[PDB]
Amino acid sequence: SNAMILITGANGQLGTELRYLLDERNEEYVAVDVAEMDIIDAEMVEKVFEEVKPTLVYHCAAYTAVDAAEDEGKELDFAINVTGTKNVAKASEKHGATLVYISTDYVFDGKKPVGQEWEVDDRPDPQTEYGRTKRMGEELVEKHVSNFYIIRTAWVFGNYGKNFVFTMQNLAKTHKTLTVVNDQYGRPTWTRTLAEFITYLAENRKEFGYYHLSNDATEDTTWYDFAVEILKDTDVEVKPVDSSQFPAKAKRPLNSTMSLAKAKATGFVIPTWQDALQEFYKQEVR
Template identity: 45%
Template sequence: MKVVVTGAAGQLGQDVVKELEKKGHQAVGIDRSELDITVEADVLAYMNEVKPDAILHCAAYTNVDAAEENEEVAYQINALGTEYLAKAAKQTGAKLLYISTDYVFNGNATEPYETDHPTDPIGAYGRTKLAGEQLLQKHLEQFFIVRTAWVFGAYGQNFVKTMLRLGKERGEVGVVHDQVGSPTYTVDLARFMVELVETDRYGVYHATNNGVCSWYEFAVEIFKQAGVEVKVNPLTTEQFPRPAARPKYSVLSKKMLEEQGFTPLQDWKAALDAYLIETNEKK
């Protein structure tokens, strides 16, 4: 397949391009310099010229705090950009896979969110990503939406890198313990995305690594596996105020993924181990 990957210079996009090439597909990686997805005419012209078999849409405005101040910009990228890609996919007959987020939910649940659970974003980032889901579905009857959470990979800024940097600099860090979710390694997510787009099993999926932890527990495990002596202090969300509200509970049910016969992503601790080996941080 010829597959266009948006956001190909990003944390997830780079691993998606690698996985496509590993599986023998022709990956056409694009970032903002090649195509501004917020310009509809450019998106339609580009896709009509390239004529991909599939589009893996990883590009996004992901700065959760900045989105509160810049919701219009986030909307242009996350919502309108996705709509234009959906229109282009319809014109060219390409499959479209859109990466969405746990932030479409309010975080008040006490058990894992199913794919059909009512959405209720509590911030600008979640609102704009949900708008992307809705606009995509307005234009396409067949689509893949993959919601994920707590993403970390070798190529971008993420919680693991931040913790290792702060831990080495300070020897002590404070991390919230009352927000719970499932970390997601970009290599594992990319593998699932490519496996999914090779099929016609359309729909909304949740994909994170298996297992559940708090940010505090995640930090403790990072330092343990990396062999770095750091004192980790548990904080409440109230003790660590941020411009954007975070969902307290971000656990996504992988029932749809398993029912459709896909291989569940490995446990998050094993994924962290693989990541630390990949980035030469494993002690």
């Protein structure tokens, strides 16, 4: 009756959040990261799948160092996002398992007008190596696994890894003014909300396919706006700057705001990003 669950990328932000959520729900799982199952090694992937025989796979393993992916991390970006996804998808296909794959706003070109939102059926056109390999991963999942969920997320933060929230908090400890870009739009996503959503889809047998999940927002939101709120109770003044002030290697999307309509139509409740931050600060971290 109960699903046998495999979590890949178990040590990452989402994987950790997810393990702790399943623990709270007294749901058993097998958690793997690099040490227990090299996703690049197909034989290994098939061996572990034959050992565990999962009915449901949460594939959270990913390479996400966007600037590095352009050059020094390019081989590992491809190996983890393409080859790793291929191996997990094929092993899922063979074992008849449902596969949940976490993807990214970076599959899009970021040119969506501000005030508009990426829908699940918009055409990917990634302008970065990270986005290119994640989109290849999406296609592999859709190709190999009939019983799939692909959830694109963005601006991910939580208590179980490095992220923009901790970065801004740390900077503010020793600076009374900070600059943050104000021409890149999107919405934060708390890993707890994301973990609750992906389990909600799978546990309730919602329709297979693509979904977009971030926290919600009542206004067009930039990194600057996010920082202002993070630091609202801190003795610091955040100042807005344009993207030309800090030239990054990888092209950052101007607008990654995603439509939450399909996710909401499943009955899932999505907190605003401001409310999610408050829940984040409260969390009795493990």
